Design an enzyme around this catalytic site. Structure first.
Site, PDB file in Angstrom:
ATOM      1  N   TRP A 137     -12.769   8.814  -8.475  1.00 34.05           N
ATOM      2  CA  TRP A 137     -14.204   9.224  -7.565  1.00 34.05           C
ATOM      3  C   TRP A 137     -14.236   9.690  -9.111  1.00 34.05           C
ATOM      4  O   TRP A 137     -16.104   9.795  -8.064  1.00 34.05           O
ATOM      5  CB  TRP A 137     -12.911  10.734  -7.151  1.00 34.05           C
ATOM      6  CG  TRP A 137     -12.051  10.889  -6.787  1.00 34.05           C
ATOM      7  CD1 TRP A 137     -10.493  11.492  -6.842  1.00 34.05           C
ATOM      8  CD2 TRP A 137     -11.613  10.037  -5.286  1.00 34.05           C
ATOM      9  NE1 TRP A 137      -9.842  10.758  -5.981  1.00 34.05           N
ATOM     10  CE2 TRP A 137     -10.037  10.563  -5.057  1.00 34.05           C
ATOM     11  CE3 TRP A 137     -12.608   9.319  -4.973  1.00 34.05           C
ATOM     12  CZ2 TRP A 137     -10.025   9.716  -3.470  1.00 34.05           C
ATOM     13  CZ3 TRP A 137     -12.175   9.062  -3.384  1.00 34.05           C
ATOM     14  CH2 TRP A 137     -11.068   9.076  -2.922  1.00 34.05           C
ATOM     15  N   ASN A 141       0.442  -3.115   0.538  1.00 35.51           N
ATOM     16  CA  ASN A 141       0.817  -2.314  -0.668  1.00 35.51           C
ATOM     17  C   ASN A 141       1.176  -0.656  -0.414  1.00 35.51           C
ATOM     18  O   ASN A 141       2.425  -0.534  -1.179  1.00 35.51           O
ATOM     19  CB  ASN A 141      -0.474  -1.981  -2.247  1.00 35.51           C
ATOM     20  CG  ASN A 141      -0.216  -1.113  -2.879  1.00 35.51           C
ATOM     21  OD1 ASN A 141       0.630  -1.744  -3.732  1.00 35.51           O
ATOM     22  ND2 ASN A 141      -0.499  -0.129  -3.252  1.00 35.51           N
ATOM     23  N   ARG A 180      -6.366  10.489  -0.109  1.00 36.47           N
ATOM     24  CA  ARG A 180      -5.366   9.821  -0.109  1.00 36.47           C
ATOM     25  C   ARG A 180      -3.137  10.256  -0.373  1.00 36.47           C
ATOM     26  O   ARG A 180      -2.667   9.939  -0.690  1.00 36.47           O
ATOM     27  CB  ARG A 180      -5.034   8.977  -1.685  1.00 36.47           C
ATOM     28  CG  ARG A 180      -6.080   8.338  -1.479  1.00 36.47           C
ATOM     29  CD  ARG A 180      -7.069   8.036  -3.041  1.00 36.47           C
ATOM     30  NE  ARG A 180      -7.101   7.159  -3.697  1.00 36.47           N
ATOM     31  CZ  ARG A 180      -7.367   6.973  -5.229  1.00 36.47           C
ATOM     32  NH1 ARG A 180      -7.030   8.126  -5.668  1.00 36.47           N
ATOM     33  NH2 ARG A 180      -6.950   5.550  -5.661  1.00 36.47           N
ATOM     34  N   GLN A 191       5.165  -0.103  -1.819  1.00 38.46           N
ATOM     35  CA  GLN A 191       5.448   1.245  -2.599  1.00 38.46           C
ATOM     36  C   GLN A 191       5.839   2.773  -1.976  1.00 38.46           C
ATOM     37  O   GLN A 191       6.401   2.971  -1.775  1.00 38.46           O
ATOM     38  CB  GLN A 191       4.007   1.160  -3.398  1.00 38.46           C
ATOM     39  CG  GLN A 191       3.851   0.829  -4.332  1.00 38.46           C
ATOM     40  CD  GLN A 191       2.963   0.390  -5.866  1.00 38.46           C
ATOM     41  OE1 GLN A 191       3.257   1.511  -6.602  1.00 38.46           O
ATOM     42  NE2 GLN A 191       2.180  -0.539  -5.610  1.00 38.46           N
ATOM     43  N   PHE A 195       3.143  21.294  -0.016  1.00 36.46           N
ATOM     44  CA  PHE A 195       2.530  21.591   0.880  1.00 36.46           C
ATOM     45  C   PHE A 195       3.566  21.127   2.503  1.00 36.46           C
ATOM     46  O   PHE A 195       2.499  21.181   2.980  1.00 36.46           O
ATOM     47  CB  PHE A 195       1.916  21.029   0.539  1.00 36.46           C
ATOM     48  CG  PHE A 195       1.489  19.545   0.458  1.00 36.46           C
ATOM     49  CD1 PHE A 195       2.669  18.676   1.011  1.00 36.46           C
ATOM     50  CD2 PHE A 195       0.334  18.739   0.278  1.00 36.46           C
ATOM     51  CE1 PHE A 195       2.157  17.111   1.279  1.00 36.46           C
ATOM     52  CE2 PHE A 195       0.471  17.294   0.017  1.00 36.46           C
ATOM     53  CZ  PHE A 195       1.338  16.355   0.246  1.00 36.46           C
ATOM     54  N   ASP A 234      -0.867  20.830  -5.562  1.00 39.94           N
ATOM     55  CA  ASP A 234       0.308  20.300  -6.075  1.00 39.94           C
ATOM     56  C   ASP A 234       1.691  19.714  -6.216  1.00 39.94           C
ATOM     57  O   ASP A 234       1.511  21.560  -6.515  1.00 39.94           O
ATOM     58  CB  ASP A 234      -0.540  18.999  -6.975  1.00 39.94           C
ATOM     59  CG  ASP A 234      -0.469  17.635  -6.562  1.00 39.94           C
ATOM     60  OD1 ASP A 234       1.269  17.197  -6.830  1.00 39.94           O
ATOM     61  OD2 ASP A 234      -0.864  16.533  -6.553  1.00 39.94           O
ATOM     62  N   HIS A 266      -2.019   8.183   3.766  1.00 37.75           N
ATOM     63  CA  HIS A 266      -1.879   6.629   3.768  1.00 37.75           C
ATOM     64  C   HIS A 266      -0.421   6.104   2.873  1.00 37.75           C
ATOM     65  O   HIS A 266       0.287   5.875   3.019  1.00 37.75           O
ATOM     66  CB  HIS A 266      -2.946   5.769   2.566  1.00 37.75           C
ATOM     67  CG  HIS A 266      -3.044   6.548   2.068  1.00 37.75           C
ATOM     68  ND1 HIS A 266      -3.018   5.382   1.148  1.00 37.75           N
ATOM     69  CD2 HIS A 266      -2.295   7.002   1.052  1.00 37.75           C
ATOM     70  CE1 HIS A 266      -2.895   5.444  -0.335  1.00 37.75           C
ATOM     71  NE2 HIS A 266      -2.721   6.743  -0.266  1.00 37.75           N
ATOM     72  N   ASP A 267       0.721   7.440   1.983  1.00 37.92           N
ATOM     73  CA  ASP A 267       1.495   7.665   1.788  1.00 37.92           C
ATOM     74  C   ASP A 267       2.992   8.562   2.286  1.00 37.92           C
ATOM     75  O   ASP A 267       4.175   7.405   2.247  1.00 37.92           O
ATOM     76  CB  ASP A 267       1.795   8.877   0.651  1.00 37.92           C
ATOM     77  CG  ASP A 267       0.677   9.072  -0.091  1.00 37.92           C
ATOM     78  OD1 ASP A 267       0.356   7.546  -1.140  1.00 37.92           O
ATOM     79  OD2 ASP A 267       0.248   9.849  -0.778  1.00 37.92           O
TER      80      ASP A 267
HETATM   81  C1  LIG Z   1      -1.705   9.332  -3.975  1.00 37.65           C
HETATM   82  S1  LIG Z   1      -1.681  11.037  -4.529  1.00 37.65           S
HETATM   83  C2  LIG Z   1      -3.518  11.434  -4.577  1.00 37.65           C
HETATM   84  C3  LIG Z   1      -4.235  12.441  -5.734  1.00 37.65           C
HETATM   85  C4  LIG Z   1      -5.383  12.763  -5.562  1.00 37.65           C
HETATM   86  N1  LIG Z   1      -5.725  13.095  -4.528  1.00 37.65           N
HETATM   87  C5  LIG Z   1      -6.307  11.602  -5.561  1.00 37.65           C
HETATM   88  O1  LIG Z   1      -6.604  10.781  -4.476  1.00 37.65           O
HETATM   89  O2  LIG Z   1      -7.139  11.105  -6.194  1.00 37.65           O
HETATM   90  C6  LIG Z   1      -1.069  11.832  -3.487  1.00 37.65           C
HETATM   91  C7  LIG Z   1      -1.165  13.292  -3.753  1.00 37.65           C
HETATM   92  O3  LIG Z   1      -0.291  13.929  -3.784  1.00 37.65           O
HETATM   93  C8  LIG Z   1       0.925  14.950  -4.485  1.00 37.65           C
HETATM   94  N2  LIG Z   1       2.044  15.596  -3.933  1.00 37.65           N
HETATM   95  C9  LIG Z   1       2.883  14.609  -2.958  1.00 37.65           C
HETATM   96  N3  LIG Z   1       3.690  15.443  -2.242  1.00 37.65           N
HETATM   97  C10 LIG Z   1       4.186  16.477  -2.607  1.00 37.65           C
HETATM   98  C11 LIG Z   1       4.461  17.789  -1.979  1.00 37.65           C
HETATM   99  N4  LIG Z   1       5.415  18.523  -1.394  1.00 37.65           N
HETATM  100  N5  LIG Z   1       3.360  18.588  -1.935  1.00 37.65           N
HETATM  101  C12 LIG Z   1       2.401  19.326  -2.919  1.00 37.65           C
HETATM  102  N6  LIG Z   1       1.997  17.694  -3.608  1.00 37.65           N
HETATM  103  C13 LIG Z   1       2.377  16.433  -3.329  1.00 37.65           C
HETATM  104  C14 LIG Z   1       1.167  13.961  -5.727  1.00 37.65           C
HETATM  105  O4  LIG Z   1       2.300  14.423  -6.547  1.00 37.65           O
HETATM  106  C15 LIG Z   1      -0.068  13.284  -5.239  1.00 37.65           C
HETATM  107  O5  LIG Z   1      -0.924  13.924  -6.605  1.00 37.65           O
END
Ligand SMILES: C[S@@+](CC[C@H](N)C(=O)[O-])C[C@H]1O[C@@H](n2cnc3c(N)ncnc32)[C@H](O)[C@@H]1O
Ligand SMILES: C[S@@+](CC[C@H](N)C(=O)[O-])C[C@H]1O[C@@H](n2cnc3c(N)ncnc32)[C@H](O)[C@@H]1O
Ligand SMILES: [Zn+2]
Ligand SMILES: [Zn+2]
Ligand SMILES: [Zn+2]
Ligand SMILES: [Zn+2]
Lengths: 345, 345
Positions: B164, B300, B250, B304, B235, B210, B253-254
């Site tokens: 960022w 990736n 991001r 992952q 969430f 988060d 994409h997870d």
């Molecule tokens: C891949 S990181 C991206 C973080 C940030 N948005 C960035 O792009 O730098 C995904 C984020 O989603 C959060 N996350 C995952 N599952 C979650 C949930 N069920 N509720 C709240 N947050 C969540 C993770 O803890 C993490 O900080």
């Protein structure tokens, strides 16, 4: 990085992502993508590749699509489907049938070197190899760690023979070796370089010298022809086969100066006047600042073996101290170069 | 390969050696080479670097010399010694003090992703992630495997904020967000993007949403300012903070389509007329055959997470099914792009 980002940021990303591109190539080799495509009656779609390599649809498509972007594969469109085919690159260097196949080395880099390289920071920190930290295998004797199993010794041996299908002619013809009727490849492995040497020099005869386990594997997995012989033993203590020329291809780089000096001394005292020593290694520029691939290879020796890559002058001090004279080297323009020194009176 | 070898052979070697170049960059970052060089009164020799990073002479020289060849460092000669200095690249992206520092992400790629990528062939073979096969850690809940320890959660969080500093402005200014006075960064992590968002939009206010463990770490390791708030929760089931705009950078994409659809549905039903959803992801070309870096990133995600990278049309089907309308995307020319959709009546 992004097409519109600053060139330095794009470069940093290229470097950071390099490990992903290596693994795509290694996994495509491990899955046999290129072999299946070469054995097919024509080009194949995702579902035909995925079925043939016994892998997932999503995974296969990602893999094939990355291969297309990397120029390892070509794609074409027919109806509502992409069809993949091999390139000149993959046909020549990535198919098992090709004489210039680089498959086994790529699979070896993927399975062993890649693992070792994760421990780079500690190999740099400590100044030593990491077989114990990576594989749990003691490396007090270098090659028992390298040949930790029978299938792992066959893989190492298959991997190493591959470079000679491309680099063999350059190194063996850098100097006119017809002058040495009887030859000995010390640490000759499977005998790939010796096979090449004999076709190049019809008058000559050669003995491949290696450890008993390598010699047995070589005879069991590679067939021979009337110019090539095998002697098993330890070059640090056993009597060496009689020869006019001793060849050391990728042997010196595995060891530190003192171990190199010991072996060079034994070879010297075994040589007769006019006798030669042919050292085949990737030469480091005199400033030790290139070529990049050689510098990476020297770092790979720190991470894996007990050695390093060396400069022409360094190989000269080593060969000159052992007693050899008339030192000459030839830069082939390839990964491997050739050094020849002689025994005088 | 060798300077005189065929271009296809040189290309194959570049790809095969890529993992070595990644680890050189990662190890140089882990050893703090660039920080020591930036903190020094001038350029430093091998012995001064080796002493400062607490590493071996041979190892340090190999590392520094490779860095010079890679254009990460510059060398100069003074008397009988080489002196190393930082480049524009390393000063801007590889020093801890730089705002655009990429250090923590590089160290993370080196420590986690690199390990995972050794199991690429099986992730392709099975179509699933390898946290259990690589770390022994169960991944049935994705983020407990990703945050396997406190120090590992701090590292992940520090790593992710870094993009960022370079890509932040592009994504947040692709669309005029001044229209959304109240915002919520869902899965906002450390709040780096939110910090940028607030300087860009002085009128606006934002809540970083988060998991409890991330929110606690964010407050304990990052200081704040009067526009940014924090809400902890899940969430997928907790009530979302009230907002005119929900930002998903991001996050999508997870996860697989079904999990994405569930979250999108919850956000939609939380939105009011005129409400927006800002999706920040690296967009795949419509043919899924580029950009290369995005394709590597999708692979990736297979290795992952539980997701993949997606095309604009794919994000459109997802957002349109959840109920959103007025879908628009903007290709920034950077790694990360922006998608904005709205809620109507
Ligand atoms: C891949 S990181 C991206 C973080 C940030 N948005 C960035 O792009 O730098 C995904 C984020 O989603 C959060 N996350 C995952 N599952 C979650 C949930 N069920 N509720 C709240 N947050 C969540 C993770 O803890 C993490 O900080
Ligand atoms: C790095 S390989 C190079 C093989 C081959 N010359 C090539 O370049 O493809 C080093 C070779 O030295 C052999 N070797 C190692 N130590 C030895 C010893 N003490 N006596 C005989 N052979 C040895 C290994 O078994 C191996 O085949
Ligand atoms: Zn002597
Ligand atoms: Zn000398
Ligand atoms: Zn609904
Ligand atoms: Zn649709």
């Amino acid at each position: 990085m992004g097409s519109s980002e600053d060139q330095a940021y794009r470069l940093l990303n290229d470097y950071a992502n390099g490990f992903m591109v290596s693994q795509v190539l290694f996994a495509a080799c491990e899955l046999g993508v290129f072999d299946l495509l070469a054995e097919a009656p024509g080009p194949l779609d995702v579902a035909a590749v995925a079925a043939g390599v016994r892998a997932s649809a999503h995974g296969t498509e990602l893999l094939l699509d990355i291969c297309v972007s990397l120029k390892l594969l070509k794609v074409e469109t027919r109806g509502g489907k992409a069809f993949y085919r091999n390139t000149e690159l993959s046909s020549d260097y990535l198919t098992t049938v090709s004489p210039t196949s680089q498959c086994s080395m790529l699979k070896y880099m993927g399975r062993t070197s890649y693992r070792c390289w994760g421990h780079l920071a500690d190999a740099v920190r400590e100044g030593r190899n990491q077989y114990l930290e990576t594989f749990g295998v003691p490396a007090e004797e270098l090659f028992t760690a390298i040949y930790r199993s029978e299938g792992e010794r066959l893989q190492f041996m298959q991997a190493l023979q591959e470079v000679w299908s491309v680099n063999g002619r350059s190194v063996l013809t850098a100097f006119d070796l017809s002058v040495f009727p009887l030859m000995c490849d010390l640490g000759g492995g499977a005998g790939a370089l010796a096979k090449e040497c004999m076709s190049l020099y019809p008058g000559c005869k050669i003995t491949v010298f290696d450890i008993p386990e390598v010699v047995w594997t070589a005879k069991q997995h590679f067939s021979f022809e009337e110019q090539i012989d095998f002697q098993e033993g330890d070059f640090f203590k056993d009597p060496l086969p009689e020869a006019d020329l001793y060849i050391l291809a990728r042997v010196l780089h595995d060891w530190a100066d003192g171990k190199c000096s010991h072996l060079l001394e034994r070879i010297y005292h075994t040589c007769k006047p006019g006798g030669g020593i042919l050292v085949i290694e990737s030469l480091l520029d005199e400033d030790r600042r290139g070529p990049l691939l050689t510098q990476l290879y020297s770092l790979n020796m720190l991470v894996q073996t007990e050695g390093q890559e060396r400069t022409p002058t360094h190989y000269h001090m080593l060969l000159s101290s052992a007693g050899f004279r008339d030192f000459q080297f030839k830069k082939t323009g390839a990964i491997y170069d050739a050094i020849l020194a002689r025994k005088g009176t």
